[PDB]
Amino acid sequence: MFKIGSVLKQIRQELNYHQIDLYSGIMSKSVYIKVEADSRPISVEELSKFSERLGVNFFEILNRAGMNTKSVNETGKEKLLISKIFTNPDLFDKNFQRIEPKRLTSLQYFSIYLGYISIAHHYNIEVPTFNKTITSDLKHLYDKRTTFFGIDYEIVSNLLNVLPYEEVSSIIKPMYPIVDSFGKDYDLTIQTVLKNALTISIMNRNLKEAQYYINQFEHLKTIKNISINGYYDLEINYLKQIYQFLTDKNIDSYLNAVNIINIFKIIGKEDIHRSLVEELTKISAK
């Protein structure tokens, strides 16, 4: 699949190391030659070692080999395809009939499925199938779960997007608090759920829930090796601000919240800016 060998040779040569420097104590010269020739599958352990030898990041090497873009597999394509269909509705149908059937194939597929459902809901397309099954789908998917992976938090984020909060909450509660970090991607999705969930809580005025998500997020900051997302920190902090304004009625809070919204415009995050503005406008009403 991925040309890891050639990336190794590439880096090996840029840094002026000889084959010997890499294989010495790990494999025969002949074998290593196969490795760089990409004619021999390399083991995670071996790759890890060559990585230390080269002095270049293991994950970076994998990325350079082709583990980046989602095109690495079917599921990846399907996901890229979504955003395409988002802007080109007409596409929907065609695909949705291939996806929908396999929505319970893997956590990855269910997420994509919810992706389509999100598009339809935006352009008001008919999705009778969805309404007649999610409840059952979620039951099947999470009834006897005990440990959650990134994809689960990804699912819950999209879930919160195409269903009433009340239908999703039951599934969230047992997924927090987080106790460990399992990579940038993992850290990212766990934060996204909080951000979306807190936003919904504020919009619907459920201050007890809002309170909860704010604490969950704050707790994340206490975790070793956790990568908090700055933009999320800003947005969640603006929500905290609004929260405090809705409760303590503190004028200062409203001011801070507005300063944060301003900052997004300043640093150029226009999309986010418009969102929070329309979100604040709304909050001073519904």
Binding site: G115, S118, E154, S157, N158
Partner: peptide, 7 residues
């Protein structure tokens, strides 16, 4: 805001 994440 209510973000959609696809990884």
């Amino acid at each position: 805001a209510i973000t959609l994440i696809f990884i």
